[PDB]
Amino acid sequence: ELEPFQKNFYIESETVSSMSEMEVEELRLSLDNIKIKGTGCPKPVTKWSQLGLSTDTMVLITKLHFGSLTPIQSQALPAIMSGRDVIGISKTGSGKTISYLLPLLRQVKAQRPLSKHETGPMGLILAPTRELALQIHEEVTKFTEADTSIRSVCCTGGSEMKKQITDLKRGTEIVVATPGRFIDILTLNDGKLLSTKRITFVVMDEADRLFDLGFEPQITQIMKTVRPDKQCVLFSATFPNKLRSFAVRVLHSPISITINSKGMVNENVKQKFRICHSEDEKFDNLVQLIHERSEFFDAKAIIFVSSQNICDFISKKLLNAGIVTCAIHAGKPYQERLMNLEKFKREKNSILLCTEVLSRGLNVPEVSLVIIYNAVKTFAQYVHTTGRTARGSRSGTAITLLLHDELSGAYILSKAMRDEEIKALDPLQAKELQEMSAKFESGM
Amino acid sequence: LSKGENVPYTFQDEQVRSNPYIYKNHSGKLVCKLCNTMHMSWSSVERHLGGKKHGLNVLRRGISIEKXXXXXXXXXXXXXXXXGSVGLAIQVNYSSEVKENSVDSDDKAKVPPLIRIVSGLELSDTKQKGKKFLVIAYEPFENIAIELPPNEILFSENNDMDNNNDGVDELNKKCTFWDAISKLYYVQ
Amino acid sequence: EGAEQVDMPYWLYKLHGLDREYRCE
RNA sequence: GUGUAGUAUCUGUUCUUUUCAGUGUAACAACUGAAAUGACCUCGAGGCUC
RNA sequence: UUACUAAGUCUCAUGUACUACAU
């Protein structure tokens, strides 16, 4: 008859809870393309203060972690603090450790102390190597140092067992261990020196490595002696089939968090840009682009603009210059939208001229060329506009006509383009891009 | 796995080797001359090299590779008393720029007089003994002594607050003063 | 005040017989 | 030039509950049982310690 | 001038032989 306990310690800050869904999508794209799976994921935070940690802890952390929250921290901290099981896929050095330590500290702190007959622990962190266990435990101590109500003992192989037994004699709220040693300690002396009965929180870090180094049997047996309503988080740089299979076995309604696994834009889309200095030059490029394309002759294009007034203007402009377009926007009667869409889907080598906001929902097949005439200002809009050309192997090209003053636009391009896409273009255009993006970035 | 290196046989009578250790004996097997261990494949050889065994033998092989004018001044003894017991105080006077005018070459000139407690167990004559002397010495002038029958007087207990400039000893810093401007040495 | 800065044979030693400290009298 | 079951032998790797008592052993090893918690002193060692 | 002795157990891999059994 299990003892009930609290796992959700998260109070969403007002500023975060005010965020809309579109805002949250955008924040995830900007944070190195965070991808989530699972139901009910809390919104990412962007500041240590949105987590409701005491001043002590705040001072301590800062001290402990210098600079901005990492993408993994932004998303994993509120999900774990909320008591959810979590799969966190991110590289070593992404700061993942505090992502689980803070919530673990909080959870263990809240539980009643160990009785005079209870060994502990309440929290268990498993690592595949002695070197990682020691590193994790060093972190832990930087927190248990201030607070004498909480101990951690590090239990690994390649190290005296008797030494660690002397520790565990005194009871311990937290254990950091390699799987073999832990199992060895559990079974030792009728399992009377270490109990699993009070473990409510298990973390497995570098989880892919645990299978690599043969620990499936040990970690599987450990999870079998742990209450199944425990909170469990699995952190790993990769997600091999073995881990995927293990998570299904040990987790409930997990939230998976993957940082920039793949590109925000399909890698088969060829992203390009041209930096211009007047609307006129932008228009000169747009025309050169439309003619040039013909020498490579389905093959259709879509010019995206930012407003209905711009769409009308550019439509007339392009007309006066011998180029006929199928123009579309929400200020036009639906009947003529349909006429233009059908004309576009009908006529060979047609050109659609469309507002960026209608891009996600356009009912047309993928195209060979997207010309973004007004650099978009969000990551979400960039994905929807460029995605109009995405088509696995048959993906075409998306090109942005950017103006010298469009700093945020350059920030988006610098974040969504592949490095090798920026290399193949003129090194001065490239250099301006990076300068534009850096200026925007320090602008905040 | 051999990386294209040629390991000559042991009997070929030794081109520099990467490791001048792993050889091939009269037979085809590979051996570590130090470790005297046989290895079937080059992979086993690399396990041997990456193993602690071979390393220990390497360290053992490295260990094998390494293998006075004498002028009596004037003292002024006087029975003192403070609180809570009784102590002695001596006032020793020195020359009045009479002879020290010929020697001023900063040769320990900055060094003040020094005192030490000597047991009479050792004397130039060695006749009688059994008491202590509070000897006081200065470079040019002659040494001076004062008999101390009482086993202990004025032997205080942490007078100052434990500051560590030993000078010569606890005795000197603890209870001496050197009026160098007037040439008067006080001791108590 | 004044602290200014500027600018292995585990089973082998048991087997050897050191499970029980021996003594020469 | 194959497959089923199974065996032996290298080498790599590593040191399993600090102690006590019994079995066991040539002595080990190994096996069998239990378990301190707290305080202090000098350079992991030490206590007619409580 | 260095007065002559080291591997063992476990674990998880590699090296190499082998024994019944079937095409």
Swiss-Prot record, chain A:
<dbReference type="GO" id="GO:0005524">
    <property type="term" value="F:ATP binding"/>
</dbReference>
<dbReference type="GO" id="GO:0000243">
    <property type="term" value="C:commitment complex"/>
</dbReference>
<protein>
    <recommendedName>
        <fullName>Pre-mRNA-processing ATP-dependent RNA helicase PRP5</fullName>
        <ecNumber>3.6.4.13</ecNumber>
    </recommendedName>
</protein>
<comment type="similarity">
    <text>Belongs to the DEAD box helicase family. DDX46/PRP5 subfamily.</text>
</comment>
<keyword id="KW-0175">Coiled coil</keyword>
<comment type="function">
    <text>ATP-dependent RNA helicase involved spliceosome assembly and in nuclear splicing. Catalyzes an ATP-dependent conformational change of U2 snRNP. Bridges U1 and U2 snRNPs and enables stable U2 snRNP association with intron RNA.</text>
</comment>
<keyword id="KW-0378">Hydrolase</keyword>
<dbReference type="GO" id="GO:0005634">
    <property type="term" value="C:nucleus"/>
</dbReference>
<comment type="subunit">
    <text>Interacts with the U2 snRNP and HSH155.</text>
</comment>
<dbReference type="GO" id="GO:0000398">
    <property type="term" value="P:mRNA splicing, via spliceosome"/>
</dbReference>
<dbReference type="GO" id="GO:0003676">
    <property type="term" value="F:nucleic acid binding"/>
</dbReference>
<dbReference type="GO" id="GO:0003724">
    <property type="term" value="F:RNA helicase activity"/>
</dbReference>
<keyword id="KW-0508">mRNA splicing</keyword>
<keyword id="KW-0347">Helicase</keyword>
<keyword id="KW-0067">ATP-binding</keyword>
Curated annotation (Swiss-Prot), chain B:
<dbReference type="GO" id="GO:0071013">
    <property type="term" value="C:catalytic step 2 spliceosome"/>
</dbReference>
<keyword id="KW-0863">Zinc-finger</keyword>
<dbReference type="GO" id="GO:0071004">
    <property type="term" value="C:U2-type prespliceosome"/>
</dbReference>
<keyword id="KW-0539">Nucleus</keyword>
<keyword id="KW-0507">mRNA processing</keyword>
<dbReference type="GO" id="GO:0005686">
    <property type="term" value="C:U2 snRNP"/>
</dbReference>
<keyword id="KW-0479">Metal-binding</keyword>
<dbReference type="GO" id="GO:0003723">
    <property type="term" value="F:RNA binding"/>
</dbReference>
<protein>
    <recommendedName>
        <fullName>Pre-mRNA-splicing factor PRP11</fullName>
    </recommendedName>
</protein>
<feature type="zinc finger region" description="Matrin-type">
    <location>
        <begin position="30"/>
        <end position="60"/>
    </location>
</feature>
<keyword id="KW-0747">Spliceosome</keyword>
<dbReference type="GO" id="GO:0000245">
    <property type="term" value="P:spliceosomal complex assembly"/>
</dbReference>
<comment type="subunit">
    <text>Belongs to the CWC complex (or CEF1-associated complex), a spliceosome sub-complex reminiscent of a late-stage spliceosome composed of the U2, U5 and U6 snRNAs and at least BUD13, BUD31, BRR2, CDC40, CEF1, CLF1, CUS1, CWC2, CWC15, CWC21, CWC22, CWC23, CWC24, CWC25, CWC27, ECM2, HSH155, IST3, ISY1, LEA1, MSL1, NTC20, PRP8, PRP9, PRP11, PRP19, PRP21, PRP22, PRP45, PRP46, SLU7, SMB1, SMD1, SMD2, SMD3, SMX2, SMX3, SNT309, SNU114, SPP2, SYF1, SYF2, RSE1 and YJU2. Interacts with CUS2.</text>
</comment>
<dbReference type="GO" id="GO:0005634">
    <property type="term" value="C:nucleus"/>
</dbReference>
<dbReference type="GO" id="GO:0000398">
    <property type="term" value="P:mRNA splicing, via spliceosome"/>
</dbReference>
Swiss-Prot record, chain C:
<comment type="similarity">
    <text>Belongs to the SF3A3 family.</text>
</comment>
<comment type="function">
    <text>mRNA splicing factors, PRP9, PRP11, and PRP21, are necessary for binding of the U2 snRNP to the pre-mRNA in an early step of spliceosome assembly.</text>
</comment>
<comment type="subunit">
    <text>Belongs to the CWC complex (or CEF1-associated complex), a spliceosome sub-complex reminiscent of a late-stage spliceosome composed of the U2, U5 and U6 snRNAs and at least BUD13, BUD31, BRR2, CDC40, CEF1, CLF1, CUS1, CWC2, CWC15, CWC21, CWC22, CWC23, CWC24, CWC25, CWC27, ECM2, HSH155, IST3, ISY1, LEA1, MSL1, NTC20, PRP8, PRP9, PRP11, PRP19, PRP21, PRP22, PRP45, PRP46, SLU7, SMB1, SMD1, SMD2, SMD3, SMX2, SMX3, SNT309, SNU114, SPP2, SYF1, SYF2, RSE1 and YJU2.</text>
</comment>
<protein>
    <recommendedName>
        <fullName>Pre-mRNA-splicing factor PRP9</fullName>
    </recommendedName>
</protein>
